[PDB]
Amino acid sequence: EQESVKEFLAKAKEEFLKKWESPSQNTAQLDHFDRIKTLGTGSFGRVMLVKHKETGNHYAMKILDKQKVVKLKQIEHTLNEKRILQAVNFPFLVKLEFSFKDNSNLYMVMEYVPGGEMFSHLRRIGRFSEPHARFYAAQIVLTFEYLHSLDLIYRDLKPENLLIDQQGYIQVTDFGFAKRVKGRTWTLCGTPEYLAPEIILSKGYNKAVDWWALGVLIYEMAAGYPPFFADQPIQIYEKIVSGKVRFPSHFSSDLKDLLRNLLQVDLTKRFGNLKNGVNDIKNHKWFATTDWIAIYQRKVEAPFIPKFKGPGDTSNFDDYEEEEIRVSINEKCGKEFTEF
Ligand SMILES: NC(=O)c1ccc(O)cc1
Hints:
The structure is a monomer. This protein is of the alpha+beta class. The chain folds into two domains: about 1-20 and about 115-305, Transferase(Phosphotransferase), domain 1 (Orthogonal Bundle); about 25-115 and about 310-340, Phosphorylase Kinase, domain 1. Helix content is about 35%, strand content about 15%. The chain has eleven helices and nine strands. The longest helix has 20 residues, at about 130-150. Bound molecules: 4-hydroxybenzamide. 4-hydroxybenzamide binds next to strand 1 and strand 5. Keywords: ATP-binding, cAMP, Cell membrane, Cytoplasm, Kinase, Lipoprotein, Membrane, Mitochondrion, Myristate, Nucleotide-binding, Nucleus, Phosphoprotein, Serine/threonine-protein kinase, Transferase. It is a lipid-anchor.
């Protein structure tokens, strides 16, 4: 690549490694914040809109219950998530502002992105046009170029994890499965529709799984549904490993060609994992109209700007039962989470 890209990535890695080696810890506490509204909820945590009581700034606070993290075998994953997030810096990654823990929970306080998840917008519109999908895809390509150069695999690409910001650009969130990996890794994780064949088949896999997932995402953005759908995961997995994909007739020939090379079941032949690396993707005809530098610099006008009233507006997120943030009087799982 141009020396300009090499030097950019060398500096990116220098800065990442310094923070990776000496992570920040314990940079706020719960009673610095007011709770506003639950924005999302899962099996071991939830994300809440909060407001800092002294500055008035809004943030999204991810709260993980230490005991449930342990029960669901997510200890290392949660430690990965925080250690990576506090060390990365890129225009399309949600910024971690504070982290801390208490007797019961782990907390990651992030910039609040009021536009909501791409998932909502995609389902509301139906599908994105190719230019619209391409604008988002280009951001993911650059983000993966960045992450992979740091030896990071993301492992959870899907529309729910892509927030739309006030300029209409992507912020990737949820580093719960992200990991620093030189070579291969083995954990079964991800969402079924987005899993590469080599994950399903229990292989030692690498960053090529992220490029497969990009193929799934581009297909889903442009079609409105993912390429390997079914009612049971096992039936999804059979389709994924089959080597067959059908494309809507409205897809351009260039889109189909790119997707055949991303959704390549032989990981040794998959775009993003060949000798030319990311440049096989960036130079593909489907991306011929993309000005990569202008995307990075946020100079391209976005396909749309989410509608929201201000930094406290939660309209683009949905409604969940509001549950307590209870902190035990006794420390739980202290040893397991020492480094957090
Ligand atoms: N950073 C955010 O605004 C955010 C919002 C909802 C989530 O589920 C995760 C993150």
